[PDB]
């Protein structure tokens, strides 16, 4: 049996209403027990999914009642009367009436206001250095949208050739972001300037958040 | 309180084979189908195969991905559940769980898995199994933000935790990152200046892999 789950992802505000849709290629609905054989499962990020819905409409022990299945045959739906920052997670369906078959899965986004990051910058560590290493990271943190960009300076002129980007998942408590940046040298390269900048550009502002120190400290 | 452990999991070569085994109690094993459930990186989950309950004469099924390739067992006497993989590819690359399936033929029977493993990441590659080096993130206000920069280790995962799993709040850890055949990431925490350095702060960088821990204190510069 072919299972799929719609829509691939979205992101709603908290309190709002949430649906989500899953169908099967036949139809789950066993004539025999007179049941649907279809689960819902829930998977927040680094964890393993958890039963909240089977038999299409029955609600496991210890899920709350703002998670409703509904649907038979070939249509199924699950629904969240009120999502709140607990919810973020990917869902997904699974027929069990021919052996057993996920669906493709609904991630759950979360929308909320808009804030800063707030701005650190690390100098490489004197371990790192005294193996010949040269790490220069820069962190924003706690901020929303997720869309962030960061522009590193050396001595005044911009740097590419070197940097990673990295971003949490959304937070579980208030649903923002934190990204790394990190510039990665040599102890030698590193050893060749002083100023060392990065400059953080989000939707908050037009002004980029600057954060900087000098390998002469 | 029923409990499911995966082990195994690790490195394995391209072509090579691997078995996984699902520690269980808290239950009568015998009573329960047992399925097997992989998910690749940001990918979905995938039902691989089951083995029945006792009454069904334990007889085994398997997705048609699998079919020639995967192979389940049980012992029940000591309610451990396996995976048998075989020739494994890239493609292979996922964390792999262990669940509790339905029992029909005695007690409470209700189409679902109740319980599942915290799963084991199984990564096929030719590349060399190395643990990380630990760096420490520190400053050049009301509070400090720390970390712990992990770089060159091979393969996922590296788990982090600060102060042993006692400092629990403020912490940011970024997913992973590949380059040039290792991967690095960076978690960190926002504590009270008034906590730091006046107290100790410590992160402790897991890589089941090679089976290494690693600790790292947090001093000022
Ligand atoms: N078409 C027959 C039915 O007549 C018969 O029901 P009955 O005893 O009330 O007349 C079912 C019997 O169902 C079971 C049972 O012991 O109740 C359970 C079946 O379970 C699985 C399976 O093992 O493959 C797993 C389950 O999750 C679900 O997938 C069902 C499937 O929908 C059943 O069609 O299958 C199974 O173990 C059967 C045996 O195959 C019986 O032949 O027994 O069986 C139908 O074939
Ligand atoms: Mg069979």
């Known amino acids: 049996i072919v299972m799929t789950q719609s829509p691939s992802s979205l992101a709603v505000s908290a309190g709002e209403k949430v649906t989500m849709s899953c169908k099967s290629s036949?139809?789950?609905?066993?004539?025999?027990?007179?049941?649907?054989?279809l689960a819902w499962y829930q998977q927040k990020p680094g964890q393993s999914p958890k039963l909240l819905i089977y038999?299409?409409?029955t609600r496991e022990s210890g899920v709350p009642d703002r998670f409703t299945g509904s649907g038979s045959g070939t249509d199924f739906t699950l629904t969240i009367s009120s999502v709140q920052a607990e919810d973020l997670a990917v869902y997904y369906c699974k027929q069990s009436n021919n052996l057993r078959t996920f669906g493709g899965g609904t991630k759950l986004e979360i929308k909320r206001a808009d804030a800063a990051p707030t701005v650190s910058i690390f100098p490489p560590s004197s371990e790192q250095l005294t193996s010949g290493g040269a790490s220069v990271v820069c962190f924003l943190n706690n901020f929303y949208p997720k869309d962030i960009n960061v522009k590193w300076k050396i001595d005044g002129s911009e740097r590419q050739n070197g940097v990673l980007n990295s971003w949490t998942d959304q937070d579980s408590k208030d649903s923002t972001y934190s990204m790394s940046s990190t510039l990665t040298l040599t102890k030698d390269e590193y050893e060749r300037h002083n100023s060392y900048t990065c400059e953080a550009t989000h939707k908050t502002s037009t002004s980029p958040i600057v954060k900087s120190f000098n390998r002469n400290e | 309180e029923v409990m499911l452990v995966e082990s195994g999991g690790g490195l394995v070569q391209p072509g090579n084979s691997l078995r996984l085994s699902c520690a269980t109690s808290?239950?009568?094993?015998?009573?329960?189908?047992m399925s097997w459930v992989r998910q690749p990186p940001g990918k979905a989950l995938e039902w691989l195969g089951f083995?029945?309950?006792?009454?069904?004469?334990?007889?085994?099924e398997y997705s048609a991905s699998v079919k020639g390739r995967f192979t389940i067992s049980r012992d029940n006497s000591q309610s451990i559940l396996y995976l048998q993989m075989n020739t494994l590819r890239a493609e292979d690359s996922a964390t792999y769980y262990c669940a509790r399936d339905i029992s029909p033929s005695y007690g409470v029977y209700y189409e679902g898995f109740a319980y599942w493993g915290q799963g084991t990441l199984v990564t096929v590659s030719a590349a060399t199994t190395t643990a990380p080096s630990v760096y420490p993130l520190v400053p050049g206000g009301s509070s400090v933000t720390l970390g712990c920069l992990v770089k060159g280790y091979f393969p996922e995962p590296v788990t982090v935790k600060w102060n042993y799993g006692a400092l629990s709040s403020g912490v940011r850890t970024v997913s992973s990152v590949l380059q040039s055949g290792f991967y690095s990431l960076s978690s960190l925490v926002t504590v009270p200046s008034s906590t730091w350095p006046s107290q100790t702060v410590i992160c402790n960088v897991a890589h089941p892999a090679s089976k290494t821990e690693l600790i790292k204190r947090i001093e000022p510069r």
């Open positions: 083995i029945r309950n006792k009454a069904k004469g334990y007889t085994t």
């Open positions: 036949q139809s789950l609905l066993n004539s025999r027990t007179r049941k649907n054989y």
């Open positions: 038999w299409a409409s």
């Open positions: 808290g239950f009568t094993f015998t009573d329960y189908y």
